[PDB]
Design goal:
Protein name: Palmitoleoyl-protein carboxylesterase NOTUM
EC number: 3.1.1.98
GO molecular function, one term: protein-containing complex destabilizing activity
Radius of gyration: 20 Å
Bound molecules: 4-methoxy-6-phenyl-pyrimidin-2-amine, 2-acetamido-2-deoxy-beta-D-glucopyranose
Family: Belongs to the pectinacetylesterase family. Notum subfamily.
Subcellular location: Secreted
Distance between the termini: 27 Å
Number of strands: 14
Strand order of the largest sheet: 4-1-2-5-3-6-7-8-10-14
Order of helices and strands: EEEHEEHEHEHHHEEHHEEEEHE
């Protein structure tokens, strides 16, 4: 069980002005720290943020959070569930800023909501240094779905923060799970309300609404008004200096959702078949030069904090093994691969996919 700590700096808030926070379980004999970012879509204007506040409030406020939370998957402390990092210090940072962990804007008399995701990460790191993070050797910033994209947007800033506070010996790394999207053509198409708004347009509006921030090198390449590009992994990843391991289903359920694909009634005709085969090929292509990656040919969404994350294999190697091999490479390894991308072209052509 990880136990809740609300941030001591009460100016760093969730959407509704309530204090943000984190769940922590220490491991006194370890110098490894795992900070995990929760996901859960986003909202980009007053009307659709108000809708989210009615029926997804724990993603916008801490007033109802529980005092503890069970560590699952990579946040588990039992070697059987977590062969990778079971003895690490474990941190779960709830997502209550609806801004893909990018915002830096306070609630005020001209802002109904606060969007402080980027500042929430920075403040969690600050306060953890007084609880043991000052003695760490490796800080792994992990995340799933919107939290996976948030890793890509924040890993280099965390590294810069620790360097300027005087801790250059801590190695900062990233683990981005299910946050690697494509700004591709949709299967069927509409004009930008909430759902008809393609991600590129919804993110462009989000950024102005949240006062979003993106990594510096990427910001300098794309420049004013085009920062939305840095929310797409294959565009921001080449600009990053910290080592980042990428986990991505080739047929991600959230990617199909934004593409207006619904697999139902099961009779796939030629146009949809070619669309789905082309999406898998495109995702494979963006990963060819990512040396640390795990990309199975499955229709699913998220993996690393799920209890049975040990079951899926690519070319005979599990995800927890691939992550251990990555640890060893950061000291090519015989029988310990780090780049694992399926080549078969249809969902579930890998027999180990989640059912
Ligand atoms: C779970 O919902 C989402 C949506 C998006 C996203 C949408 C448009 C552009 C870039 C990213 N990203 C993540 N990581 N999660
Ligand atoms: C509290 O957080 C705000 C916003 O990030 C920051 O401006 C301020 O310096 C912080 N105060 C302390 C004491 O860390």
């Amino acid at each position: 069980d990880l136990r809740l700590h609300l941030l001591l700096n009460t100016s760093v808030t969730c959407n509704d002005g309530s204090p943000a926070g984190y769940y922590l379980k220490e491991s006194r004999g370890s110098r490894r720290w795992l900070l995990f970012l929760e996901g859960g879509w986003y909202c980009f204007n007053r009307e659709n943020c108000d809708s989210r506040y009615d029926t997804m409030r724990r993603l916008m406020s801490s007033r109802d959070w529980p005092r503890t939370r069970t560590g699952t998957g990579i946040l588990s402390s039992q070697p059987e569930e977590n062969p990778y990092w079971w003895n690490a210090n474990m941190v779960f940072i709830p997502y209550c800023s609806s801004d893909v962990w990018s915002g830096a804007s306070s609630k005020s008399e001209k802002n109904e909501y606060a969007f402080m995701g980027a500042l929430i990460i920075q403040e969690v790191v600050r306060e953890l240094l007084g609880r043991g993070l000052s003695g760490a050797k490796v800080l792994l910033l992990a995340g799933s779905s919107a939290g996976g994209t948030g890793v890509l947007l924040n890993v280099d800033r965390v590294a810069e923060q620790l360097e300027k506070l005087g801790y250059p010996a801590i190695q900062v790394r990233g683990l981005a799970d299910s946050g690697w999207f494509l700004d591709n053509k949709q299967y069927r198409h509409t004009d930008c309300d909430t759902i008809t708004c393609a991600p590129t347009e919804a993110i462009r509006r989000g950024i102005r609404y949240w006062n979003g921030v993106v990594p510096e090198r990427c910001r300098r390449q794309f420049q004013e008004g085009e920062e939305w590009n840095c929310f797409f992994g294959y565009k921001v990843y080449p600009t990053l200096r910290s080592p980042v391991f990428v986990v991505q289903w080739l047929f991600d359920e959230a990617q199909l959702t934004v593409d207006n694909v619904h697999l139902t009634g099961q009779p796939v005709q030629e146009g949809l078949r070619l669309y789905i085969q082309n999406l898998g090929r495109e995702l494979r292509h963006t990963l060819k030069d990512v040396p640390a990656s795990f990309a199975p040919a499955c229709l699913s969404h998220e993996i690393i904090i799920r209890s049975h994350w040990t079951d899926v294999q690519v070319k005979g190697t599990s995800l927890p093994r691939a992550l251990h091999c990555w640890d060893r490479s950061l000291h090519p390894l015989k029988g310990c691969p780090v780049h694992l991308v399926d080549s078969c072209p249809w969902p579930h052509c890998n027999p180990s996919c989640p059912t």
